[PDB]
Every structure is written in C-alpha cells, then in structure tokens.
Amino acid sequence: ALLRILKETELRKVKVLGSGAFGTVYKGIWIPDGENVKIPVAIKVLRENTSPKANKEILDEAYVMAGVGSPYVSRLLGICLTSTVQLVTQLMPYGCLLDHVRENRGRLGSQDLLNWCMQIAKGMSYLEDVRLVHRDLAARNVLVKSPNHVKITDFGLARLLDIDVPIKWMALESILRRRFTHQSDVWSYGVTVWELMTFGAKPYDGIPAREIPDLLEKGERLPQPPICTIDVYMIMVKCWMIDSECRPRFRELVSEFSRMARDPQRFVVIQN
Numbered sequence: 663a664l665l666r667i668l669k670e671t672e673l674r675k676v677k678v679l680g681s682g683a684f685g686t687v688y689k690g691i692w693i694p695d696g697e698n699v700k701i702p703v704a705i706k707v708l709r710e711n712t713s714p715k716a717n718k719e720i721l722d723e724a725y726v727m728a729g730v731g732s733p734y735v736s737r738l739l740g741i742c743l744t745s746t747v748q749l750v751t752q753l754m755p756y757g758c759l760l761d762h763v764r765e766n767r768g769r770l771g772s773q774d775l776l777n778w779c780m781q782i783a784k785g786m787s788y789l790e791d792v793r794l795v796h797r798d799l800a801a802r803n804v805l806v807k808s809p810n811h812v813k814i815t816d817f818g819l820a821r822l823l824d825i826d827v828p829i830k831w832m833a834l835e836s837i838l839r840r841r842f843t844h845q846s847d848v849w850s851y852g853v854t855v856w857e858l859m860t861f862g863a864k865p866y867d868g869i870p871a872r873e874i875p876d877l878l879e880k881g882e883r884l885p886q887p888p889i890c891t892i893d894v895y896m897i898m899v900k901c902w903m904i905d906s907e908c909r910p911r912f913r914e915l916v917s918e919f920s921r922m923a924r925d926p927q928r929f930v931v932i933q934n
C-alpha cells in the first residue's frame with residue numbers, strides 16, 4: 663500500500679548509463695538512514711520539460727506491481743522528490759542483454775540462451791497477471807543481473823503532448839491500428855528470442871519500415887537462426903501469427919522453454 667520516500671542525502675550519482683524520451687538513468691549508491699549498508703542502484707531522473715499528465719503514467723504503472731512481484735521484472739525500491747522526480751531501483755551490473763550477447767558470442771552456451779528465454783517468459787507471465795501491457799519488449803529492454811539472472815524493464819508508453827515507434831518488434835495490428843494487448847507482447851517476445859538466438863542480429867536488416875506490413879501479410883518472416891533446430895523456430899513462428907488468438911499464451915511459453923532447458927544441446931547447436 664505505502665510508498666518509500668528516499669531523501670536526497672541518501673543518494674549519490676556516479677556515472678551516466680543511458681537515456682530516452684522520458685528520463686536519464688545514472689549509476690549510483692543508496693545509503694539508507696539508520697543502517698550501516700551501501701546498496702548499488704540505478705537512478706532515473708525524469709525530464710523537467712515534460713508536463714505533469716505525461717510523467718503520471720510512468721509512476722502509476724510502477725504502483726500496480728506493489729506486492730511480492732517477480733524476480734524477472736524490475737522492482738521499484740522507492741522515489742526521491744527534489745525539484746526533479748527520481749526513480750530508484752537495484753543496479754543490474756552487466757547492462758542490457760543485447761550488448762551482453764554481442765560481446766560474449768564466442769563463449770555462450772545452449773543452456774544460457776534457453777534459460778534466458780524461460781526467464782523472460784516468466785517475467786511476462788507476471789505482467790499479464792497484474793494486467794500491465796509492456797508495448798516495447800526487446801533485447802535492449804531486458805537487463806542482466808548476472809549471466810544466469812535477467813530482468814525486464816523500460817515499460818513502454820505513448821508521450822502525452824499538449825502540442826504547444828519500434829515497427830520491427832510490433833504485431834501487425836499494432837502497426838496498422840495502434841492496438842496493444844498481451845497477445846501483441848507475445849509477438850515482440852518472438853522477435854526478442856530471435857535477437858538472442860542470432861547473438862544480437864538486427865531484425866529485417868536493410869528492409870525499410872514502410873515495407874514491413876505488406877511482407878508480413880504475404881507470409882514473409884524473420885529467418886531461422888543458424889544455431890536453432892526447427893523445434894525452437896516453430897515457437898517463434900507461432901508468436902508471429904496474424905490471428906492474435908492463435909498465438910501461444912505466456913504460461914505455455916514458460917512450459918515449452920522449461921522443457922527445452924532440461925535438454926539444451928538437443929534443441930540449440932553451438933560450435934563448442
């Protein structure tokens with residue numbers, strides 16, 4: 663129910679990690695009052711130019727995930743309120759999963775890749791339990807706590823303006839009508855799995871975004887990754903069905919990748 667407010671004196675910014683349309687993320691340290699501890703944190707400072715109604719949707723989305731949560735989705739530790747709005751969370755020291763897979767292409771195993779697929783599916787199952795549509799699931803928006811533990815973050819939203827999109831991850835209905843559901847998140851999950859299994863290849867590389875809807879209706883899809891057996895590719899293909907009702911549920915995806923994770927060398931073919 664309650665919300666933990668952290669004073670400015672409890673927090674210290676060290677380095678800039680990244681940014682987007684809504685805010686700037688810093689690496690930092692949290693020292694809670696009346697405790698002899700240091701906690702490494704990420705601190706997201708929201709931009710001052712944006713209106714009150716625009717920043718409202720970011721905060722309200724965090725407050726839905728109030729109770730126990732999931733270990734595979736980012737957890738808000740608290741907020742700090744100066745002239746700026748500062749959102750505080752546990753630091754994920756290996757950064758985003760897209761950068762991680764590209765760097766470690768030489769030494770990653772079949773067990774590691776399929777474990778990540780299962781963990782992302784478990785995290786998305788929790789977001790469906792609390793009725794939270796992500797709108798922007800991609801390898802860039804999954805963080806790495808360690809090589810055997812990943813967390814979903816960077817929850818998507820349209821910027822509300824007074825006046826004064828990731829097309830290659832989106833379901834067909836989302837491109838043409840701007841309809842976002844739990845079943846459109848499943849499409850984006852399929853593309854995320856394709857990124858991991860290609861060691862961070864760019865989807866539809868060379869094809870302009872305007873051409874994507876016509877190609878999808880014709881039946882063209884992203885190619886089978888070189889390391890994947892057909893059994894793995896079949897799950898990706900089910901995620902990209904035009905009929906949203908025929909796509910698998912996130913709980914069924916947890917079941918499938920858990921089974922494949924119990925015999926990873928059968929399903930994914932690494933050189934080593």
Ligand SMILES: *[C@@H](CC(=O)N1CCN(c2ncc3ncnc(Nc4cc(Cl)c(Oc5ccn6ncnc6c5)c(Cl)c4)c3n2)CC1)CN1CC(F)C1
Nearest residue numbers: 679680704706724736737738749751753754757758802816
């Ligand atoms: C990927 C590169 C990339 O984009 N990033 C990796 C480096 N950065 C980074 N590193 C570690 C880290 N740990 C923890 N948290 C963050 N980022 C973050 C994100 C959000 Cl959305 C955030 O706010 C909320 C809001 C609501 N909420 N509810 C529950 N939890 C939360 C969190 C916070 Cl406080 C912190 C983080 N970031 C930046 C990300 C490749 N990329 C492709 C090229 F463009 C490079």
